[PDB]
C-alpha cells in the first residue's frame, strides 16, 4: 500500500510535465 | 414502542477540553514569546 501510493504520484509527475510541454510548445508555435 | 421499562420508584467546540483545560497560567506567554538568547 505504501508502494502504490508513491507509484501513483510518480506517474502524476509525468502528466503535468507532459501537459506543460504540450501546450507551451503549441502556444509559441502559433 | 418499548418504554425502556423500569421498576424502581461557552461555545468551546472541544475547545472546552481545550478551554476548561485552560484557566490560571499563561497570559504573559501571549506576547512573551521572544526574550531568551543572551542569558538563556
Amino acid at each position: 500500500y505504501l508502494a502504490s501510493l508513491i507509484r501513483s504520484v510518480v506517474a502524476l509527475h509525468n502528466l503535468i510535465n507532459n501537459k506543460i510541454a504540450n501546450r507551451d510548445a503549441e502556444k509559441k508555435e502559433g | 414502542m418499548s418504554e425502556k421499562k423500569q421498576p424502581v420508584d461557552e461555545d468551546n467546540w472541544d475547545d472546552d477540553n481545550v478551554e476548561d483545560d485552560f484557566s490560571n497560567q499563561l497570559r504573559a506567554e501571549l506576547e512573551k514569546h521572544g526574550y531568551k538568547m543572551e542569558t538563556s
Binding site: 505504501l2 508513491i6 504520484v9 | -
Partner: protein, 52 residues
C-alpha cells in the same frame, strides 16, 4: 523510569512481567514517507496552479 518491564495491580496486590516486542518499525517508517509525499503533491499543486 523504564528500569523494568512490569505492571502492578492495586485490586490484586500482584506484579506481572511481560517481554518487549521489537516489531513497531515498519509502520513507523511508513507514515513518515506519507509526510514527504504530502509535500511533493503540494509541490505539484502550485506547479499546475502557476501554469495549467
Amino acid at each position: 523510569d523504564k528500569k523494568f518491564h512490569g505492571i502492578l495491580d492495586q485490586g490484586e496486590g500482584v506484579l506481572i512481567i511481560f517481554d518487549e516486542p521489537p516489531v513497531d518499525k515498519t509502520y513507523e517508517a511508513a507514515l513518515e514517507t506519507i509526510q514527504n509525499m504530502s509535500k511533493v503533491v503540494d509541490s505539484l499543486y502550485n506547479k499546475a496552479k502557476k501554469l495549467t
